């Protein structure tokens, strides 16, 4: 059976959370594939189905529990289970469509949304954008409950989509970036709750192509520089992978390591 990693919002501390994200990174990749000091997620090609997903079980103070499903290849959420029902983001292809039939094999009810799980569609179905949707142990607490109650008609679509945006950023993107993991770390210490600033949004949007640029780079140097944004929304280019080592923590597999 797939590995499970547990996290409650109930009594969460900086350490309780950090452990979770570091545990998630550990089961996402073996860490044998490292380019320029940055780990690589497993290559989708040739990967046994029994190593394709990990499971993340989130619980909260309200004594509710959901289990999300992450794709090791992307570190992104593909669906979740809540009691007797599993819901899945629409697969972009027939390989993915078959893969999720290996998930939560023992549930009574399985459904597939018409919509993908990319930010673009979810923002639409939520009415908010990522920069309008607060993140924090509070918003996470609320996301766990909304997802739980969607099975029982008690959760409306905009709130469901919005809760996804909360989960995906605090789990997937936090695993992908040490920067974003920190931004959630600060929100837990000083007990804050706030939307991500442009430094975060920019990274999430750029994760795939940062991954490409680092892997197809020349001894670290980007072929073309990549523009990001600071917290204050100012724009700056990145020319080399060195500035990113304390920032990106996982890359998607793009190419075999060069000599």
């Amino acid at each position: 059976q797939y590995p499970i990693i547990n996290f409650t919002t109930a009594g969460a501390t900086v350490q309780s959370y950090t452990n979770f994200i570091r545990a998630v990174r550990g089961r996402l990749t073996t860490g044998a594939d490292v380019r320029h000091e940055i780990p690589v997620l497993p290559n989708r090609v040739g990967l046994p189905i029994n190593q394709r997903f990990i499971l993340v079980e989130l619980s909260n103070h309200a004594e509710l529990s959901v289990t999300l499903a992450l794709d090791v290849t992307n570190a992104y959420v593909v669906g979740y289970r809540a009691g007797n029902s599993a819901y899945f983001f629409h697969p972009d292809n027939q390989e993915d469509a078959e893969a999720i039939t290996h998930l939560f094999t023992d549930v009574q009810n399985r459904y597939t949304f018409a919509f993908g799980g990319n930010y673009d569609r979810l923002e639409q179905l939520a009415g908010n954008l990522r920069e309008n949707i607060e993140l924090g142990n509070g918003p996470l607490e609320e996301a766990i409950s909304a997802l739980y109650y969607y099975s029982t008609g008690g959760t409306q679509l905009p709130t469901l989509a919005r809760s996804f945006i909360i989960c995906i950023q605090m789990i997937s993107e936090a695993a992908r970036f040490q920067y974003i993991e920190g931004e959630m770390r600060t929100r837990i210490r000083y007990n804050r709750r706030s939307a991500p600033d442009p430094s975060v949004i920019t990274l999430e949007n750029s994760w795939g192509r940062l991954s490409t640029a680092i892997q197809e780079s020349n001894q670290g140097a980007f072929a073309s520089p990549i523009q990001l944004q600071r917290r204050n929304g100012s724009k700056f280019s990145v020319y080399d992978v060195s500035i990113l080592i304390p920032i990106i923590a996982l890359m998607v597999y793009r190419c075999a390591p060069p000599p």
Binding site: V45, I49, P91, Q94, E95, A97, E98, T112
Partner: protein, 202 residues
């Protein structure tokens, strides 16, 4: 597209083909489904040519190996060490997982796999003689098929399915007043380039 028949000796192995035309060969799954004579449908496993991923039913995990020749647009299923319980038909199937093109299921003709040590034997044709039923007993042939007619024809005839070498029956029945007219059963065994037309006399 699949071949219709394969002979294969006991404890030997067979490598079955499935050429795919008329769609993106690297965008769908190709499945294998096994049907034994007069029994149900068992799913053996599948393969996704575009990514090489496989699945095998636990009941076939060590008997079968699926692999794909992207060049020919073809899939292969290889079974190991064939027993008599392995003699059956092997369909390959394209079907969709999901929703958007749900009714896309499409089956190959199938491949009848016989497992035998036998050789192309000719057939013996014995007459069955006593409103009156007549008959031929086609005995001890290999391979299949034989094909029996009575000129023709045509009605009241029951050509039975072969049983195990192979052997079938065939009844014709006719009005009793017709015992003065010639009734002959015409066997043909295509593989032994043999043809027998036995007059049924009393």
């Amino acid at each position: 597209q699949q071949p219709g028949s394969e002979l294969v000796r006991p404890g030997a192995s067979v490598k079955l083909s499935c050429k795919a035309s008329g769609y993106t060969f690297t965008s769908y799954w190709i499945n294998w489904v096994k049907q034994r004579p007069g029994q149900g449908l068992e799913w053996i496993g599948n393969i996704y040519p575009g990514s090489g991923r496989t699945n095998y039913d636990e009941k076939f995990k060590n008997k079968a190996t699926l692999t794909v020749d992207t060049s020919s647009s073809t899939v292969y299923i290889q079974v190991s060490s064939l027993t008599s319980e392995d003699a059956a038909v092997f369909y390959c199937v394209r079907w969709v997982y999901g929703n958007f093109d749900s009714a896309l299921d499409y089956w190959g003709q199938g491949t009848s796999v016989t497992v035998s040590s036998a050789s192309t034997k000719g057939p013996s044709v014995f007459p069955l003689a006593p409103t009156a039923a007549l008959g031929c007993l086609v005995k001890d042939y290999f391979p299949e098929p034989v094909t029996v007619s009575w000129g023709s024809g045509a009605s009241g005839v029951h050509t039975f399915p072969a049983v195990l070498l192979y052997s079938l029956s065939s009844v014709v029945t006719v009005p009793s007043s017709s015992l003065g007219q010639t009734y002959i059963c015409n066997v043909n065994h295509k593989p032994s380039n043999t043809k027998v037309d036995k007059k049924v006399e009393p």
